[PDB]
Amino acid sequence: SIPYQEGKYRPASIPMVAGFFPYNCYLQQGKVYSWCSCGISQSGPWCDGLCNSVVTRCRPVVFNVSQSGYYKICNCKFSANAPFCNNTHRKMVRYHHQTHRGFYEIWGAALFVLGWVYMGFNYYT
Amino acid sequence: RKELWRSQDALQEEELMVNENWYPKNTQYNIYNQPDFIKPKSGSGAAADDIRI
Amino acid sequence: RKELWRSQDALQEEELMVNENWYPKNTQYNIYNQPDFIKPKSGSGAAADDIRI
Amino acid sequence: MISARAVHRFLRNPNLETGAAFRAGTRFDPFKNTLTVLKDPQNGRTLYLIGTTNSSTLLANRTKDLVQKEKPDAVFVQTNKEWWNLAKNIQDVKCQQELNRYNDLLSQAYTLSLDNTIRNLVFKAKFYSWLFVINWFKAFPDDFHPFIPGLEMKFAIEEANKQNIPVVLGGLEVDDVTLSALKVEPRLDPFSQLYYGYRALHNSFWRREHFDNYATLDVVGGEAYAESMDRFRTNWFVKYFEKLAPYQKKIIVDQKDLDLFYALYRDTPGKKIVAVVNQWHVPGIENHWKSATNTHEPLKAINPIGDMDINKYMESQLVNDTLRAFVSKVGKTEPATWKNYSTIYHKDNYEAERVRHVAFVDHKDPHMYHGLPQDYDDNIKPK
Amino acid sequence: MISARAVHRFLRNPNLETGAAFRAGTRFDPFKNTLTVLKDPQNGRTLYLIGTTNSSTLLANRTKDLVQKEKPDAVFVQTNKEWWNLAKNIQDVKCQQELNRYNDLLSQAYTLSLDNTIRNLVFKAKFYSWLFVINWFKAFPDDFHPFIPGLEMKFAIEEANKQNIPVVLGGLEVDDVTLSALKVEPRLDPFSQLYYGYRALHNSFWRREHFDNYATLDVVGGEAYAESMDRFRTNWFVKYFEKLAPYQKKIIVDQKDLDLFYALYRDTPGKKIVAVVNQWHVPGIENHWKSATNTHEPLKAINPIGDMDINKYMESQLVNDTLRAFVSKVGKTEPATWKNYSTIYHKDNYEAERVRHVAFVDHKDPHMYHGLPQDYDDNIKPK
Amino acid sequence: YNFPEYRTGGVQANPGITAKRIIKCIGERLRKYDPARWENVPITFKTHFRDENGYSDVATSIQIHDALEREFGIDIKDRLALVTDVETAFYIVMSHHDPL
Amino acid sequence: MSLSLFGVKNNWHKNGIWWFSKILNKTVGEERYDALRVQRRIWSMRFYYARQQCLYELFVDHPDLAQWTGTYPKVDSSHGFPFYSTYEMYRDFQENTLNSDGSFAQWITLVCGIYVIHVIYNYMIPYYWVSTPLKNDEFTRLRMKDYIASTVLEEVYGISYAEWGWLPHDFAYNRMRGLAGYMHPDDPRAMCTSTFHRKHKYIEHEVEKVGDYHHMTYPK
Amino acid sequence: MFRWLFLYWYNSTDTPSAIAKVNLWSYINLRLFKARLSSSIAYYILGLNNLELKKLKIFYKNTYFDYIYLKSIPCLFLIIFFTNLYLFL
Numbered sequence A: 001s002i003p004y005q006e007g008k009y010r011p012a013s014i015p016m017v018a019g020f021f022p023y024n025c026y027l028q029q030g031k032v033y034s035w036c037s038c039g040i041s042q043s044g045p046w047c048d049g050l051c052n053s054v055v056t057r058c059r060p061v062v063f064n065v066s067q068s069g070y071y072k073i074c075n076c077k078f079s080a081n082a083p084f085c086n087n088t089h090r091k092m093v094r095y096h097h098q099t100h101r102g103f104y105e106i107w108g109a110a111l112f113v114l115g116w117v118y119m120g121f122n123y124y125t
Numbered sequence B, C: 001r002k003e004l005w006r007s008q009d010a011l012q013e014e015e016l017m018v019n020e021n022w023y024p025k026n027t028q029y030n031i032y033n034q035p036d037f038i039k040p041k042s043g044s045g046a047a048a049d050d051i052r053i
Numbered sequence D, E: 001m002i003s004a005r006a007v008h009r010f011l012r013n014p015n016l017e018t019g020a021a022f023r024a025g026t027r028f029d030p031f032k033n034t035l036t037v038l039k040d041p042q043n044g045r046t047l048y049l050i051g052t053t054n055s056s057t058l059l060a061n062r063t064k065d066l067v068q069k070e071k072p073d074a075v076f077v078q079t080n081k082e083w084w085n086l087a088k089n090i091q092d093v094k095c096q097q098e099l100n101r102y103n104d105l106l107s108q109a110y111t112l113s114l115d116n117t118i119r120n121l122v123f124k125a126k127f128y129s130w131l132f133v134i135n136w137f138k139a140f141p142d143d144f145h146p147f148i149p150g151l152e153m154k155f156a157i158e159e160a161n162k163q164n165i166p167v168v169l170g171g172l173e174v175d176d177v178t179l180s181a182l183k184v185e186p187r188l189d190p191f192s193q194l195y196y197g198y199r200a201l202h203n204s205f206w207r208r209e210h211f212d213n214y215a216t217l218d219v220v221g222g223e224a225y226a227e228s229m230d231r232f233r234t235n236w237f238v239k240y241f242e243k244l245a246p247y248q249k250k251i252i253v254d255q256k257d258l259d260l261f262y263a264l265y266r267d268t269p270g271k272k273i274v275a276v277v278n279q280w281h282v283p284g285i286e287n288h289w290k291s292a293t294n295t296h297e298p299l300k301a302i303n304p305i306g307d308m309d310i311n312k313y314m315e316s317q318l319v320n321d322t323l324r325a326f327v328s329k330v331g332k333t334e335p336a337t338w339k340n341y342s343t344i345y346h347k348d349n350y351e352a353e354r355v356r357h358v359a360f361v362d363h364k365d366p367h368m369y370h371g372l373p374q375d376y377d378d379n380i381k382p383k
Numbered sequence F: 001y002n003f004p005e006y007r008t009g010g011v012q013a014n015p016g017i018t019a020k021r022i023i024k025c026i027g028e029r030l031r032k033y034d035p036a037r038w039e040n041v042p043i044t045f046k047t048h049f050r051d052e053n054g055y056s057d058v059a060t061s062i063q064i065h066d067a068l069e070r071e072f073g074i075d076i077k078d079r080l081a082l083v084t085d086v087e088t089a090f091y092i093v094m095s096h097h098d099p100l
Numbered sequence G: 001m002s003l004s005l006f007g008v009k010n011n012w013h014k015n016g017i018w019w020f021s022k023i024l025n026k027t028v029g030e031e032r033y034d035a036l037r038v039q040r041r042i043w044s045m046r047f048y049y050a051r052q053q054c055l056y057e058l059f060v061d062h063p064d065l066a067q068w069t070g071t072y073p074k075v076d077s078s079h080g081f082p083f084y085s086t087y088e089m090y091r092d093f094q095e096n097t098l099n100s101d102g103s104f105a106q107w108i109t110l111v112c113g114i115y116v117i118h119v120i121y122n123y124m125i126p127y128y129w130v131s132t133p134l135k136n137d138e139f140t141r142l143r144m145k146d147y148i149a150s151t152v153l154e155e156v157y158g159i160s161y162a163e164w165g166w167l168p169h170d171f172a173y174n175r176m177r178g179l180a181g182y183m184h185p186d187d188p189r190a191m192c193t194s195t196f197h198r199k200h201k202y203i204e205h206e207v208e209k210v211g212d213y214h215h216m217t218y219p220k
Numbered sequence H: 001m002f003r004w005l006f007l008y009w010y011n012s013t014d015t016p017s018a019i020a021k022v023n024l025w026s027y028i029n030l031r032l033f034k035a036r037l038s039s040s041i042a043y044y045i046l047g048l049n050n051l052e053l054k055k056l057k058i059f060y061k062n063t064y065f066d067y068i069y070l071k072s073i074p075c076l077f078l079i080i081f082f083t084n085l086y087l088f089l
Ligand SMILES: CCCCCCCCCCCCCCCCCC(=O)OC[C@H](COP(=O)([O-])OCC(O)COP(=O)([O-])OC[C@@H](COC(=O)CCCCCCCCCCCCCCCCC)OC(=O)CCCCCCCCCCCCCCCCC)OC(=O)CCCCCCCCCCCCCCCCC
Pocket: A021, A022, A023, A024, A025, A026, G017, G018, G019, G020
């Protein structure tokens, strides 16, 4: 495992994007948490051991909290303030939309839904 | 922070435990037969409404 | 009983006070600047509900 | 200062894995379990404290012989004038088995004299209901009547009268002072008593101990059970009474033994004292006497970490590390696991989670290779 | 071990009967109240910690001269890059009042950048309402703006740049980290804040101290008030903030000063450090630095009973007893009262209750005549 | 101010401190739960929480589990093992990857 | 005290692991909540360990019955010597279950079983209630037993959403047709069926107002 | 006659190699009945120096009806009390 980089975290390998928005998790004071870096953990944001079974240099981030409460744990695994979210998921989504194939996929889904919208609009004729 | 956080009370407790003559002291009886044991004050009032166990 | 009753805790407290180096010990700060003062454990939880004063 | 030493402890050998023929201790000791000797050097006094269940002819005649041999300066007996009169009127009885036939007659010693005011009548109703409930929970047989004085105290009083020795009566278990204390105590009700009595055995250990004690009593009988009564068993019974009724138990045990200690220590006529008391009061009286006299047995301080073989643990860890390094170097590989011996608490055998002791902060951390074969030289020695 | 020494103490001379011209302390000290020097012998480091309210040209130029003279290896300033940019753009200003004319422009440094998510919007609403309420409770004027960095920090940064010295920015009072901590803290509401702030002054002492501090501020002005700011006054203000909002006070003061101490102790480039910080964070940083360095000023243990004149009390009692015995012997009578000097706390002057020191247990008690003239001989001496 | 140690495996690196902490927490929990049985009984490393015949008390074991988990900031897997003695408690604490 | 209903904290995280659980813990007092949690854990673990002891005894004494039940070998071979009564696992019971891989199959099976139970209750058991002529209230009893079977919602419900398949003009024609078909007063199915005296929700072309007719039966 | 597999297999002297010397095979020495473990749960955990076996015994199997009835009396009395309360309610 690796310690908590104070806003200077760069994953060793490219992690799996577990999600596109963070988890609002209640952390206990003084309890050690093993945030998942690879992104394929089956136990949520916390390490499940699948980093040992997947080919990746991303290791779990072991950290502690001095005051219990709600924290936004990163799920995209690209936050520079890992394990804490820093709105990097929004930039990840924006880059996905900027990419040629990502733009096509997003707008294809959008137009597929707009098909339902148009059917509802024109239901009476 | 990068270092795992521990309370100052926890650090002091660890430092005390590092001593070779450490023993629990918040006990009403000298179970460990320590010559320097001092009977702690009993947290019971006149009503004695918390003696049931 | 014909003798005025005092609890064993009270008698022990009086005996300790008879000492010339006695000082209150259930304090969070070393107000009396005693070199042997030990920081008592803080009775506050994570919620910190009782901190308000 | 307060000499807060262990008292009313019933747990035997908590550090031994007892079982089968390896018992925790021997509860059978008819003489030592109920004979205690205490000394007061400052006043040059000796006390022979006897804990009697009033249901053993063996112990009765042993106490008679002890009194005859010692010729005490004074005798204290936990009984009352009414019971003494009844016993002295009863004549030609030498065995506790025959004496037990008079238990109902001797039960009249519990005069419990009180008026019939409104408050006293309500107290009488509550107290008698609670006494019935507590006797139900006791479930003692006719042979075993610890709170009814019998042959032992009768012999003690008769021998004292023969030898012209002062006799001091301490009263029955529930005498006028104890009854007044119970009346002062308001927490007494048959329904709550039943609830707490059937809710007291909250642990399997308590249930098993209760079953063991009462099955032993039933199988062995009153006299044999009295003979085999032990200090640990008496402490367990005291704690069981505590659980059944802490408020009543306080008055009936702690205050009663404090009063008995006061009587035996402050207002004892002679230097040699022979005291006969209910057995469950012996621990408290003995503790008070020892604390007052500053004659407690010196016990060596016990370190809570003194029984841990830290050296053995560290040596095992070092040996396992050396073996892992040697095997890894021989095989030109690394250890599969860092567990000295496989255990199934952690599901490392069939899950992705592993147990590897490799932790470092940065690329220039000297402890980078700790736990790996690269930490040992060609001679299999740490670097 | 934990160095649990006095911190955030504002009570001056609790053992003196002050009043009129006999004051308890001197709050006015322009240089000592804000300049602190700390040393770490182990690392051979020196720290010049300055507590600035950002509203004193005198202190600003004093800090500028101190930086020029010391030539520190590094400078730490409690500000941010946006404020530094605004200040450097603002040129040709040498007066604190002139800079205060830009206070609104400098307030733009509180970027408090956050997204407009539903949770963040609810936060923003609660936080800004609470900020309005707490500013209302502060009731500070434009002249005194302790949380808006100004001329002193501007001069410090400019001199550091001129001398080519590293500059470390610690952020405003409410920076990104502080805002994140406040967001984590859920206990924040304008209504509860108003209730607690108007219920905080629960003692006449607190009410009078608040009135005194704020009347002094109003009468003297921002600059004079900053110059006269004292350690005790700062501690009182910290405790007042604690009473207003302890949950927010924790984050604003304790955590912030702990972080500042971390920055100044663990990640300081050079040996000589010049730190400029809000004054109310100086006590905590100094306490942490002294505790870490083991360089607390050696204090002498004070006995809680060392200031009691037990000898004088006993001598007075003995003298009064001797006088009473002498008067009683002369008059062939006994004392009317055993009170050394009449006082009306006990209504002995006009009620049956008396004060007579005559107590004994029995007819053969040697203390029978204690306190009576019969205890003294014809020479007026005890027997 | 005392800075917490940078290294993680302090509990494993200091077996004695972990054992002392386990003893303290177990003693406190036992005295709170069943005072009549453990008030006068010292708690040492070789102490066991079984009856004279070897049978275990699930209630006492779960109380010990709760005390240990609260102290060390971990989660004990009750279904996998039962703490019948301080030796078992020490084994579980050392086995746990991240106790504090 | 504060407007932080959804952000209330707890001293120990296990005393309510959700926002509503933490609110309940605050309302009830954390001491009582912790005591209740510990007591519940004690009960559950007592039951679990008793069951484990029983399963271990079963495995050691009667291995075939343990294999039939699907219990794993309860003995541990960490010492290295394999046990003398090990067997292959029969996991059909625990795999063809709503909680396992056969969850969908067992959901379909449960649906079919509930439907068959309802069919039995409506059609099979009542058939045996009457098998001979009855002197008193024969028709009443026959209709009592027939009502539960002839009025099942499967073939009665649906007219309330007839517009899903009936267009406005088709809806009006089918309305008149259904009124004619169910005109018979003696019809519990007609009683339980949704009324035809209503207008098409989308658009009505024939009936302007409901109940304004020239014949009590014909909708027009 | 063994209870533990490790003790049974640590030192075997009745193995076929040794028995073939005498060429006698008694029926009472069957490996089927040679060893049999106890009915109580026993699991290994890592000790200070080596794996140690811990036994998990939960309940006894020799209780009798008198004891069970004595433990059950309160349940019957509570049933009666609740029923009477309902009747009087
Ligand atoms: C007397 C009473 C009788 C009652 C009778 C019954 C009443 C009716 C039945 C109610 C059924 C409730 C179902 C929800 C169960 C929630 C379980 C729970 O509480 O667990 C605790 C769980 C974890 O607890 P914890 O550990 O303490 O963590 C707390 C943290 O704060 C955790 O915070 P966090 O930020 O980490 O995570 C929270 C949240 C954070 O993320 C989200 O917010 C998820 C959704 C947005 C994600 C994307 C954001 C980016 C922008 C999206 C833009 C498009 C949005 C619109 C989409 C198109 C339009 C619909 O993430 C999620 O929950 C992910 C869910 C994603 C799928 C949601 C899709 C819903 C579709 C249906 C919409 C219907 C709208 C109706 C009209 C509304 C206006 C009138 O916390 C929560 O779930 C929090 C929310 C609790 C909601 C309570 C129930 C409210 C009512 C919901 C009704 C739903 C619609 C109707 C359903 C059909 C039946 C009626």
